[PDB]
Amino acid sequence: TVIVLCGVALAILVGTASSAACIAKARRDCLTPYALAPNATVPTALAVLCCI
Amino acid sequence: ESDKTFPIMLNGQVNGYACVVGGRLMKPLHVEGKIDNEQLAAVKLKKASMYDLEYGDVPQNMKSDTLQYTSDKPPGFYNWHHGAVQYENGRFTVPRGVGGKGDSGRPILDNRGRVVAIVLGGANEGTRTALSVVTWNQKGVTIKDTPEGSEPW
Amino acid sequence: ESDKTFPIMLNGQVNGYACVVGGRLMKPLHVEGKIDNEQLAAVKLKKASMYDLEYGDVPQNMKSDTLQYTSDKPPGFYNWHHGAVQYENGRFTVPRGVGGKGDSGRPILDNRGRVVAIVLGGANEGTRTALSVVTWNQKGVTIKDTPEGSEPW
Amino acid sequence: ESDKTFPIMLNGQVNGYACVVGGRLMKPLHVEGKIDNEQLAAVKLKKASMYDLEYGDVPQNMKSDTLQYTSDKPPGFYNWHHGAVQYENGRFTVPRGVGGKGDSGRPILDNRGRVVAIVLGGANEGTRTALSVVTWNQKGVTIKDTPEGSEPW
């Protein structure tokens, strides 16, 4: 039971870390072109989605 | 160009030319070194590796003295520290042999003292040299335009 | 004044002045920054917080070439980097409009080249501006003269 | 001499000189201080303590242009920063009152712009001052010459 609980906790932790890393990389990919240019008329769906 | 285009120094050699545009400093990622200005050495550089660049926010004093971004690029001759650069068919070219290593980050200048593109590298195609650069877009998208065979200076 | 008065740097901007008098270097406390001189950067400063000042012993190669002090203060016009300052009714005043932030620690000189007071702040009355400074006395007492509403510059 | 001889600075005071000869940088051991140059600061210094010297491989970008050396030493006058050194009886002499502390490491140049010896100190014998230096020899040997009552500058 301890092994199963530890495995479940590790799976949850790695899944959350992977989701956070993918979201942050998506933010980098979809935001860095607009941060190097003036007047970033950005549809706010992306920033609102991945800001939190 | 002379006043507000700061070389990057390293081992007593200039490796590039970091440029302050629109209130933000930019420095090509492929080149390595230290910035001569003391103020610029204290800025945190966020790295966009996919465009081979890092950018940071200039301090309050130097925001007012910066070159001007642009979007409109009619084809023709444009200014450059080494002379004139020909823009045609959505491509930047220079006379063969001009420029080289240590010139990365140099901003191409417009007639009205406005920056059009930043030099990253150059590919020699025999007759001319095609410049691998980063250009702007009408929707404010920084397109990294690199012709085949480009070499990062 | 120009030779023996130094600027203090705050992120690369002038924000005050440090004065060498009689072999000791004084600097206002409220103004925060680094002394431009490399030698003075190594001088330990002991602070009179209630006088809003810090003083230190200057090195051996500048103490003689210093702003000689004095205590006799007849009323009238006295020298100043920005012009003339009127000492009347035991108060230092300037025309309203000249002087401001970054002028703290500015020495006020005499006609013969001696220092009479060091400026710390100013308050605008509308007609003139009364300067909150430190003034010396016949008995060797330095009174921090601050008119009502004084704001340190 | 002015171009390729670099002062040594410590605490804002010039206390020594480092020289480049034959593609290698020498500095003397008695004087302590940094070298303003980045590359020389990055050079590993192999120290001969009994020779009172440290030698380090000069980087590539300035090895091409370096002082040339010589071993032939005809007696007579040899040019140097504050005039001429008279070489006679296997000894270097300068007149009384010229030179002093901080002039160590200064190369002694030939008429054809070649280094023959490096001064380390001086000793006062009344009529003149005898220079304790590091002379060379024809057989690939380097000999330190010092008098009675040496004083390393």
Side-chain angles (χ1 to χ4, degrees):
Chain A
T1 284
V2 152
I3 288 284
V4 162
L5 269 41
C6 282
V8 164
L10 171 64
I12 273 300
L13 266 170
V14 74
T16 46
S18 151
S19 65
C22 289
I23 271 176
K25 210 54 157 198
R27 207 180 188 64
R28 274 151 201 121
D29 277 342
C30 272
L31 194 126
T32 195
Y34 281 36
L36 293 173
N39 315 334
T41 39
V42 196
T44 80
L46 325 170
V48 166
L49 281 156
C50 287
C51 263
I52 299 155
Chain B
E1 283 188 5
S2 62
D3 289 340
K4 40 173 58 46
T5 308
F6 310 172
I8 319 87
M9 182 36 49
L10 182 65
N11 311 338
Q13 277 71 241
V14 286
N15 312 3
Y17 282 88
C19 187
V20 293
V21 177
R24 49 189 64 260
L25 161 73
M26 308 151 176
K27 174 282 191 163
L29 170 71
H30 73 273
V31 86
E32 190 72 29
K34 86 193 174 189
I35 186 43
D36 187 13
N37 191 357
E38 308 178 7
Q39 308 323 315
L40 295 201
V43 198
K44 317 185 151 160
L45 271 299
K46 312 174 63 52
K47 314 168 278 248
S49 59
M50 50 97 79
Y51 291 148
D52 207 4
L53 190 135
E54 41 287 38
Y55 60 95
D57 194 4
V58 310
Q60 212 83 331
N61 44 18
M62 321 213 67
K63 74 212 181 303
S64 52
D65 261 40
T66 36
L67 318 87
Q68 285 309 76
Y69 27 82
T70 206
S71 158
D72 298 8
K73 304 165 196 62
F77 302 117
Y78 280 85
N79 309 4
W80 186 34
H81 164 281
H82 286 141
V85 295
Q86 185 37 300
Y87 177 36
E88 191 177 356
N89 285 339
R91 281 182 168 81
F92 265 49
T93 165
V94 307
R96 204 231 71 73
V98 78
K101 289 196 185 296
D103 304 315
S104 268
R106 204 91 52 100
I108 303 322
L109 254 298
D110 204 347
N111 306 334
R112 288 132 295 269
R114 302 167 315 79
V115 182
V116 163
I118 313 203
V119 166
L120 273 167
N124 283 283
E125 64 104 25
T127 75
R128 304 261 300 151
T129 279
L131 271 178
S132 63
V133 278
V134 298
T135 69
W136 272 239
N137 187 354
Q138 288 205 343
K139 265 213 176 184
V141 153
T142 305
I143 308 177
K144 167 252 283 188
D145 292 322
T146 59
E148 282 76 8
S150 305
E151 192 295 342
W153 284 339
Chain C
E1 254 188 355
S2 63
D3 265 346
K4 294 191 205 167
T5 314
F6 294 63
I8 330 304
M9 269 317 82
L10 177 58
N11 301 341
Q13 301 95 237
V14 300
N15 67 339
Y17 291 95
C19 188
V20 181
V21 172
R24 46 187 63 249
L25 160 63
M26 291 55 68
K27 166 212 310 173
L29 171 63
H30 70 279
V31 153
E32 181 65 31
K34 71 182 181 184
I35 181 65
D36 201 14
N37 197 349
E38 299 170 356
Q39 313 304 70
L40 301 178
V43 162
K44 294 182 183 178
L45 271 298
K46 61 218 167 301
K47 337 200 292 314
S49 55
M50 61 66 58
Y51 273 147
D52 206 13
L53 194 75
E54 42 263 16
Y55 41 100
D57 189 9
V58 310
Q60 73 94 40
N61 70 91
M62 28 210 88
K63 54 201 197 315
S64 72
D65 222 7
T66 189
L67 270 40
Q68 165 46 20
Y69 40 68
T70 165
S71 179
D72 289 17
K73 303 163 172 38
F77 292 115
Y78 288 88
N79 301 167
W80 181 34
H81 181 247
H82 287 121
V85 290
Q86 167 57 272
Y87 183 48
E88 199 169 4
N89 296 342
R91 299 176 176 82
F92 267 80
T93 169
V94 313
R96 202 236 55 74
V98 54
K101 300 180 190 294
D103 293 319
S104 285
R106 184 91 69 179
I108 297 198
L109 277 275
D110 213 39
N111 312 139
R112 289 129 290 269
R114 303 156 309 146
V115 281
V116 55
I118 274 190
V119 171
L120 292 186
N124 297 278
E125 191 294 341
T127 69
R128 302 283 300 287
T129 293
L131 290 188
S132 58
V133 317
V134 83
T135 59
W136 306 25
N137 204 296
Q138 291 187 347
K139 268 221 172 188
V141 155
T142 80
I143 309 164
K144 211 225 280 182
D145 294 326
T146 76
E148 281 75 5
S150 305
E151 198 280 328
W153 284 353
Chain D
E1 278 192 10
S2 64
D3 288 345
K4 324 181 55 58
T5 310
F6 215 142
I8 298 314
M9 61 305 298
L10 167 72
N11 303 334
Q13 285 85 245
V14 178
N15 56 346
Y17 283 78
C19 183
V20 54
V21 180
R24 219 143 294 132
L25 179 83
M26 305 51 79
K27 202 258 201 171
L29 189 73
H30 52 266
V31 54
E32 180 61 32
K34 91 189 179 189
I35 183 69
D36 197 11
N37 210 345
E38 304 170 0
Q39 337 88 21
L40 311 188
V43 165
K44 299 179 180 180
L45 266 302
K46 306 180 74 40
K47 312 192 288 294
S49 46
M50 162 265 268
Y51 271 56
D52 204 312
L53 213 64
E54 321 65 37
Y55 59 97
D57 203 358
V58 166
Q60 210 96 333
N61 46 334
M62 42 205 87
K63 88 194 193 312
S64 61
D65 230 8
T66 59
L67 281 54
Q68 280 325 110
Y69 47 79
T70 188
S71 164
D72 291 24
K73 304 165 182 55
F77 300 110
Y78 274 100
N79 49 37
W80 97 275
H81 180 229
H82 297 140
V85 189
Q86 170 51 267
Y87 174 36
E88 195 191 9
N89 294 327
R91 293 183 175 88
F92 280 22
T93 172
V94 85
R96 215 232 60 73
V98 184
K101 295 181 184 294
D103 318 297
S104 296
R106 196 109 50 180
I108 282 314
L109 265 282
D110 204 342
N111 305 330
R112 283 129 303 258
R114 264 181 291 81
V115 192
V116 59
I118 317 189
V119 52
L120 284 188
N124 287 270
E125 64 104 21
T127 69
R128 306 281 298 285
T129 309
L131 289 184
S132 43
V133 317
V134 200
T135 49
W136 300 18
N137 215 74
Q138 304 182 356
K139 253 202 162 193
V141 152
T142 48
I143 297 169
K144 204 173 321 183
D145 276 327
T146 45
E148 288 84 6
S150 308
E151 204 285 328
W153 281 335

